[PDB]
Design a protein around this ligand. Structure first.
Ligand SMILES: [Ca+2]
Ligand SMILES: [Cl-]
Ligand SMILES: [Cl-]
Length: 557
């Protein structure tokens, strides 16, 4: 009987679930866990885990929506869900990750926390004939679960357990996710406006079905600059640029752009002015004052004209024969490379190129999971094929025929992948008018999703909803790669300003951040403010350039 107790916990295994097909597998009491070097202390709590809507898909495979929920004995009254990543399919510890490379989890701050696998299981839904762990795309309902339904079901189940376990409903609910988790957050704001009061959506894949389009585009754009072929005769896209070549490119970007914010410090805060000024075909190598593009043959100090032509085309984004942009363009930024000690940053090049030191293609968008996901999860009908065919399929991508498939329905696939996965709506009025607050962030050197495309969504949001900065703000991060890493201030506590905005009405005029790898700048630490779009961080003119107190958020100089 007694609330928030070990007995209340075990009783959850007369509990009425919102979905009748909810099956509790574990309801176990957990002692407090001390802090570790990489994780804050976890309070005493009830762990509930189980699944919703066990079934068999039309592919003969089993499917269910897994969840894991943790409810602390000492509870602050708030509910918290963390978002997913990749193509989901895994169930985390569900202590409420807040991203930003943070030590603390939401459970360590006495939230009740929940996580899902998105409706499929990478250990079970791994089909060798359907490109491995993306195979859930062969089941229409599993697609719908991945797009929106799993997070809806798990939110309802979690809130129901909270109300039963504590004798009262959550005062406020919070959702934080990055990447695929960021798409989920935007989706919740659009499709389920009252599920969460506060949403953090980092590097959000809100047009994820278009990623494979960009992937085929960057693959074909980079092929003229590749050197060699892989085991099935596909150009080695990873050989198009060495790490030294990419570092040369970012040094050229810094040469053109670093000081456009007023401070030569290795960070391009004035990203708009950089885009307008930088052209690798006209820019100079600052180390030697010569043109970045070779006049003669290839040296370590220049880039071949084919290299320059290739990267420019990849960064421009895909079009069809009519010239219509199919996704968006990408921003030149220093975080495309980076050097800390003797280690080159791999956090940008792994997406479109892959590791240089390999005899095979391994880029996410050439032969990796992104290309695989587009083929089976997002094309309708799905296009399963052997793993060794994926790279060739990207080289033969037809930008007039293939991009239509993310909008198509076929057979039992009664929704398009943009229908169930896309989160492009700017109608956040219901969300805003019940008190919802949303923090978006995106690293400028993200090669998975374009930071400029997030910016264009924010522009459209501001136009559809005048005064949108009162409930939704965007924080771009110079130098940061996808969700983390790179030469920028990629670490931040987003949960604290989110709670302040939701509950005290305090909008974040800036968000403190620090660099996880300050070696990129040759310093022991760098702290900087993140600034709400379209402001940027501006140095005050005096003081240590690595200290956040010497910076302020303002317009570009
Ligand atoms: Ca700068
Ligand atoms: Cl993290
Ligand atoms: Cl100082």
């Amino acid at each position: 009987v007694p609330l928030a107790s070990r007995a209340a916990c075990e009783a959850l295994k007369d509990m009425v679930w919102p979905n009748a097909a909810t099956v509790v597998e574990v309801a176990a009491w957990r002692d407090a866990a001390p802090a570790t070097a990489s994780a804050a202390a976890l309070p005493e709590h009830c762990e509930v885990s189980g699944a919703i809507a066990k079934r068999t898909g039309i592919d003969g495979y089993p499917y269910e929506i897994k969840f894991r929920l943790r409810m602390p004995a000492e509870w602050n009254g708030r509910f918290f869900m963390e978002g997913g990543s990749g193509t989901n399919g895994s169930l985390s510890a569900a202590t409420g990750s807040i991203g930003g490379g943070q030590i603390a989890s939401a459970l360590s701050r006495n939230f009740a926390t929940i996580a899902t696998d998105g409706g499929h299981d990478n250990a079970v839904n791994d089909n060798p004939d359907a490109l491995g762990t993306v195979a859930f795309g062969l089941d229409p309902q599993a697609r719908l679960d991945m797009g929106y339904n799993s997070y809806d079901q798990v939110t309802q189940a979690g809130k129901a357990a909270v109300a039963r376990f504590y004798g009262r409903a959550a005062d406020k609910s919070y959702f934080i996710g990055c990447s695929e988790g960021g798409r989920e957050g935007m989706m919740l704001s659009q499709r389920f406006p009252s599920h969460y009061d506060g949403i953090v959506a980092g590097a959000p894949g809100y047009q994820l079905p278009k990623a494979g389009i960009s992937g085929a585009w960057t693959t074909q754009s980079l092929a003229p600059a590749a050197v060699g072929l892989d085991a099935q005769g596909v150009p080695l896209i990873n050989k198009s640029f060495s790490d030294a070549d990419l570092h040369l490119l970012s040094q050229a970007i810094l040469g053109t752009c670093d000081a456009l914010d007023g401070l030569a410090d290795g960070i391009v805060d004035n990203y708009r002015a950089c885009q307008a000024a930088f052209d690798p075909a006209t820019a100079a190598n600052p180390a030697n004052g010569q043109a970045l593009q070779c006049v003669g043959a290839k040296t370590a100090d220049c880039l071949s004209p084919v290299q320059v032509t290739a990267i420019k085309r990849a960064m421009a984004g895909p079009v069809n024969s009519a010239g219509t942009p199919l996704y968006n363009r990408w921003a030149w930024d220093a975080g495309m490379s980076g050097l800390s000690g003797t280690t080159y940053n791999q956090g940008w090049r792994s997406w479109w190129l892959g590791s240089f030191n390999s005899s095979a293609n391994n880029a996410q968008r050439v032969s990796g999971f992104s290309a695989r996901s587009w083929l089976v999860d997002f094309a309708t009908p799905p296009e399963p094929m052997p793993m060794t065919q994926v790279a060739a399929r990207m080289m033969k991508f037809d930008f007039d025929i293939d991009p239509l498939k993310i909008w198509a329905t076929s057979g039992q696939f009664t929704q398009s992948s943009m229908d169930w996965h896309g989160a492009t709506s700017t109608d956040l009025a219901a969300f805003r008018d019940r008190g919802g607050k949303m923090i978006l962030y995106h690293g400028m050197s993200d090669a998975a999703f374009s930071a400029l495309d997030t910016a264009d969504y924010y522009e459209r949001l501001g136009a559809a909803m005048p005064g949108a900065a009162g409930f939704a703000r965007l924080f771009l991060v110079p130098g940061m790669n996808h969700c983390s890493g790179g030469p920028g201030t990629d670490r931040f506590d987003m949960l604290t300003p989110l709670v302040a905005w939701v509950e005290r009405g305090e909008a974040p005029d800036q968000i403190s951040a620090w660099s996880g790898t300050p070696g990129y700048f040759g310093v022991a630490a760098r702290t900087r403010p993140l600034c709400p779009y379209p402001q940027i961080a501006r140095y005050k003119g005096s003081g240590d350039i690595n200290t956040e107190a010497n910076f302020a958020c303002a317009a570009p100089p």
